[model samples]
Target: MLHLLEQIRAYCETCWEWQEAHEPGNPMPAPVEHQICPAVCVLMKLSFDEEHRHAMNELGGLQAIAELLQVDCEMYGLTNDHYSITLRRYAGMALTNLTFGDVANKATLCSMKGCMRALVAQLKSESEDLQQVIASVLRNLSWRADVNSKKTLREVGSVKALMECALEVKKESTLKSVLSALWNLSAHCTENKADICAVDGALAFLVGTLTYRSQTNTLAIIESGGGILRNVSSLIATNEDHRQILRENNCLQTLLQHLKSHSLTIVSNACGTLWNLSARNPKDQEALWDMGAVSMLKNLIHSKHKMIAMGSAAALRNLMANRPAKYK
Candidate 1:
């Protein structure tokens, strides 16, 4: 392993120099068709190692990989013409790995000219393999991204593509990946929630993914699903029709089932959704109360997360505002 690290680190420096030495900032040349696999595979392997990741950021592997994202190795007449896709896919993977526990690497990725645009292009690819890999990179980049990165992502049409990809994949893990990006996008960018809803049936589709599980799996689809719903529910607060659309789609009833999830994220998001739904809508408030929302909030009245308790308190206030026989 130590021997391989030396070789990998040395080779990474070589690639970095090759990229930096190009004239007029010309496109970073490919490593030929056969060479791409070995190169990308090695880098992808090293990307998993935290020490190697820090090494990658320092040794220009990040920049080299970012440059790879925009190249078409097939155009170079390499024997492995099909290797272009592999090169790009693994490049995305390497960058995603670099971002693990490293803010500088994330900044470096976003700083690269057209890197995000190139990634969006990959997401638009017809190949499911490539789409999945590129989306994975976006998901990593979206992790705790600041407002600027989120805005850049939104401008690059990632949201629509992500929704389409999530809608296309039937796998729980894949939907979780796609919706996680949507959650990050909407977290700091307020307008994106409504934008998510503006997509045809997106609101209902998100609401529909909120099932609670007996086991709170590490990769909880409910976490991402509930987050997307809660963020998008911001739009629901102001627009009665959007709120109505959710109710019509059985949104509140769906949320009711998630309140007991062992995952606090699921519960918090469920409570947040309830807060929005019942905060201003008496009809919906009655429905939530009828669905047993009061006891649900009471169970979490001393929630570890202050925001969850506070939001539910406000929602409870609205829930009891009308003093309906059912609520009391």
Candidate 2:
């Protein structure tokens, strides 16, 4: 298996050279003149082949392969534009295998955590492409783990470590990655009925990120903020106790301030969250109504974003689904 990985590494280098030779005005190398290197195609085929997947898993498993690929990805210099694209495709394939392979389990989750830890340590390179790839890997890991099952708490804890890595990277270009991590974290917490302790720190980090002067940073914050709200609603849905936690934290007011932003996605998600929270508790409904959430949803219903309009409409329908006796 080690020998095969070395061969694969060498093959990747050859392919990289061939790709470089294809640049405009550069003459193609005669060894494979005018022919695309078959490495990518071959790797793609192997990635999907069931028997090969089993063999790979038996040989070194998903985590091992992912770690090997990460090393190769770094050695191949993924920060370079052309090389990065190829590496992304390869890393993406490895991620798919890791997510779906038979060996995918808590043990593999631990291995992935190690791989991500190594990646995070190397974030000084700070390439957008690298951050995006790491984020994708983390997202896949989150989905594969069963958050509702206590059996996978270790995996969830591993995910939390990866989220911290994303936060540490904190590059403007890496905000999308950070947002993705936060979204996944929120979902995990909600599904597992986990305490909001981890989420509180994450929300504070997001608030700081939102303070950045760049529009891109603001956009990232809005996207993640929406996810945060949805998760909060889910938590409240499971138990009314979570509502008091949010209230004490003034979370509803924070949502309202975000709703005032022109970002339709942010406003729509906040409204959906509000509706869910209100549906779960009568007193919260009155609280949201008093906070003018109804008026805000009405305005959002007219948003230029079809998604926002649709989301707001659904939220309004939900808000009125079981009308109180007085409102009815």
Candidate 3:
């Protein structure tokens, strides 16, 4: 099986070269016939093989394939961009199948770990495009994997290297992509309560991105930050540690101030996240009430944006549901 796989990899490399030579300006051919090459043909055939299914279930098969594609990606550069995309897509498909219990077993999990390790290693590369692609692959894997499993993997330090990569790339124009990857990672952490420290660190990083000076970009950043907060709130609630972190960092007040800004979407999401946090602890709920969250949400309830108004109302309802006397 290993010999067969090596042969297939060599064939794909050759096909990649031929396609690059014939399709210089057009990296992606409209039809297979337009750029038909032995490598492409072999890859297509291998994609559908029943044995490939068994391989995907094996401990190292997916990782091997991903590593092969990364090598091809570096070797061919832009000329083979399409192949890289295809490779990422295939990896995502394989990972998703493993995640959804389609291949629920230790062997499959081991394969996933191997694949993720390879992708994480790629993040250390100096190439910005490679970093972006690696980030995308990480996000896709995180989205598909079981939340608890992903958290466990991170807790075991499998993702620390990738998280550092994300921080290093945070200021690049491609930071949005990195943010998305971190967002997915944070979601997994929240779902499993696996890495509260990492989640808190991510929250701080995201909050730092928000500068009220750029209304548009600030709103975007706030919306994204609110998403992270919502996930964190749902899982951790308002634990004493979280509250102390928020208080010392002034994140809660900063969020409340941002909620009073022009973006209704930002306001609604922030309100919902705040409510979630407060609901988990009575003391926090009192603090939120003292902060005038009630009156602020009341104004939001009458906002012109219907979704904003409805979402704000829903948040208010949730808050009231948990602490009925607070509203009275």
Candidate 4:
């Protein structure tokens, strides 16, 4: 373990000191960042002792990776080279892995001026790989963000950048990755959630998979899917039309389908969406009541999961309020 840390720190310092300079006709230099990127990536991803985690920041580890991101992969035109592309991709990946846990590193990265801005700029990159890792990095960062860091994320237009990425991607993995990032960013912020559904295709993209069909049943999709729906549902207060838009997109029935899911995450999120959907929309509540979903929710009260129980209970409370006293 000590030997691994020694090599890891050696690679980190080497990559940090290397400069990224590319000329059109000049002989391409050794892409030093690319050379040691895998080593750094492996280091970041490995289970490190507490001593090493702190060493990452104390030994220019955090600073090194952030600076690596500053390499302008586009105008630097290193794409034609094998190493620069590899370097750019994994540099972001390393950061993604490093910030995966609940730690001060996330706050440290968010605190860096223009650190997130540089990542956001890459949302427009031609490489879907770069887009995926950058989005993933932001997602992990959001999970670890505190009150102040989340505000910084919103202030830096992270929501807008993620929406754009969601709009452009065709790959399911990339699409899901960006959508997951959007969910995390939007989960705790009103403006962030508003920014997502406010975009033309953002909400559609978020729940579009479930809206359109099935082939993706992974928990990742379900969790991200449920989160986005719950967040969108939260907006019923701000815009009475949200329920209409959600229903028009078929998000309502899709959420209903998730109620039968074994995964409590799916069940809870579905309940939240329905709870909010029918909360202020009397017509929508009546529609659910008519579907016999009104009766099925009674089962959720007995759910072992508190979130599912709470959400379903809340939805039923609202639904019963819409009916005659005898129906209660």
Candidate 5:
């Protein structure tokens, strides 16, 4: 392991040279593709391990990988070529793995000059793999980020790219990743919550993913999409426009369907979202009750899972609190 770290550090040095040569104001001849691509691929693989992740960060691997994101393969006439794509994908994936569950690495990578912008730029790439990679990076960063870091993330356009990707991505895996990233972004941040709904079709995509019957209806999507809606709806408790958007998109019906899902997280998130959307919002409250949410929530009020029971119990209380005179 010690031997491998040393070799990885050496690769980092070589990568730094390539980065220097390609620096915008002082461009030199392109480095050999064979040398740079394989090193990045190896870094991607090694960073998957926790110990190596920390070690690599100390060995200057973090900056090396971050610079790869800014590389312009078009300058070398390698645009869309196999090697260029591999470099882009491997660099993003390496950063993703490096930051996974590691707050220090997440902060370090984001702090690197041009790193955050480069990442946001990569999110616009046409490749599905690159999209998934950048989304995963943001998801990891947002998951463990402190309040200050999250604010920095929002300022750097992470929230916008994530919401946009959630709207436009076609692959289920990519959609799932982007939704999970949005879930973290919106978790407790009112600003991120507003930005999420600010993106056209973002909320509708979440609702559509929940209720649509297709290959996209995987358990992961349901969980992530439900969690994101759970966060977004919480902030819209008193905002009629956002509430109306959810209602118009049939989000209440989707929550009702999720209430029947076998997954505990799904059921709890759905119940929580219902609770938020029903808070003093008479239209959604009436709509949910008309969909038989009362009986469904009643069935889960004593669910063995603590979160599920608490969520359903809270949801039931809100529905009762806001019940129309006719339901009474």
Candidate 6:
């Protein structure tokens, strides 16, 4: 472990110096200069160890790897070239693992001004692998961001960039990453939820993702996608519009369907989203009741899973309140 850390530190130093000396439009040199990407690949692999994170931070490996995103690979004739793409993909993957569950590392990375900008811009990369890595990195950074960090992410247009990526990216892995990032960004953040719904097709895309019966869709994708809806639905205090948006996007039917999902987590999330959407929204309550939520929730209320039972009971209580006599 010590030896691997030593090698990562040396590679970081060399990679940093190389970026310092090289400028855009520079000539490609032989031998040493070409080692940057390979060095980054090493950084990505070694940084995967949980024990190595703080030590790697001591060597400034976090910032160095992040700087790779800002490097002018095109200057060395790297452009869309395989080498440059590999370098970016590796650097982002390295950051993703390094920052996972590390509060200090996330704070340090988020504080870096250009780092977030470079990272967000890379979401537009043609390479889905690179896009997935950056999305994972963003997801980590925003895990529990502070006010300033959230503001910085918003200023850099992370929400919109992620929206576009979610709209365009078709790969399941990439979609999962993108949805997870948006989930983190929107979680418990009122402004972010508003910003997300403000984007054209953002709410629709989420609904589409939720309802998508694709063979490629995994539990992780549905959980994260539903998580975003759950968070957005929690905004009932002053944003009645969001509830209507959920209804208009056909979220009622979609969420009702999720109550029947095989995964307990998915069902619990769907129940909570329904609970929130039904609160004080008589239209949605009647609509959900009409869709037979009571019968579906009946089985869930007695579920062996604690969350599933509690969630279904709470949702049922809301849907039961203020119902039309004619419907019952």
**What shift in Å separates residue 197 of candidate 3 from its native position after superposition?**
3.5
Give the lDDT of residue 186 in candidate 1.
69
Selected candidate, larger TM-score, 4 vs 6: 6
The lDDT of each candidate is 0.70, 0.55, 0.54, 0.70, 0.75, 0.76
* Better-scoring candidate (TM-score), 1 or 2: 1
Off by over 4 Å in 4: 1-54, 73-81, 211-217, 324-328
Tens-place lDDT digits, model 3, residues 1-328? 3334465455456556666676636353222343323333344345455566566445444444554554444444444345455554454334433333343432344345544555556566565665665555555555556645575456445355555665667445345555555566666644333353354365456455544344334445456556655656665464676566666666667766867777765676676666666555776666667787767777777777766677667767766666646456
Per-residue lDDT of candidate 1, residues 234-267 (tens digit)? 7678887678778777878778777776767877
Off by over 4 Å in 1: 1-34, 73-82, 212-219, 324-328
lDDT of 4 by residue, 1-328 (tens): 3333454445445433443433334343244634455655565565245566666656656656665565434235425445555666777876775676847778888887556778887788778888888888888888857997898888788888888877788766787788788778877678787887778766666667554344565566667766776876678545766556666777766777888777777788888888887777656776787677777789899978888888889999988888733455
Query: How high a TM-score does candidate 3 get?
Result: 0.57
| Best-to-worst ranking by TM-score | 5, 6, 4, 1, 3, 2
- What would the TM-scores of all predictions be? 0.81, 0.52, 0.57, 0.81, 0.86, 0.83
Tell me, what's the RMSD of every candidate?
Answer: 5.2, 11.2, 10.3, 4.6, 3.5, 4.0
Q: In candidate 6, what are the lDDT values of residues 99-164, reduced to their tens digit?
A: 888877888888887778778878888888888988999888888877777778788889889988
Per-residue error at 34 for model 1, in Å?
A: 5.2
Model 6: residue 87 alpha-carbon error in angstroms? 1.2
Candidate 2 clash pair list:
none
With candidate 4 superimposed using the best TM-score fit, by how many Å does residue 238's alpha carbon deviate from the native?
A: 3.8
Candidate 3 has an lDDT of 0.54
Positional deviation of 84 in candidate 4, in angstroms? 2.9
Candidate 4: Cα lDDT at 197: 75
Q: What is the Å distance of residue 258 in model 3 from its true position?
A: 2.7
Candidate 5 per-residue C-alpha lDDT over 111-181 given as tens digits, one digit per residue, 9 for 90 to 100? 76467877776666677777898898888888878766776788788898888866778888788788888
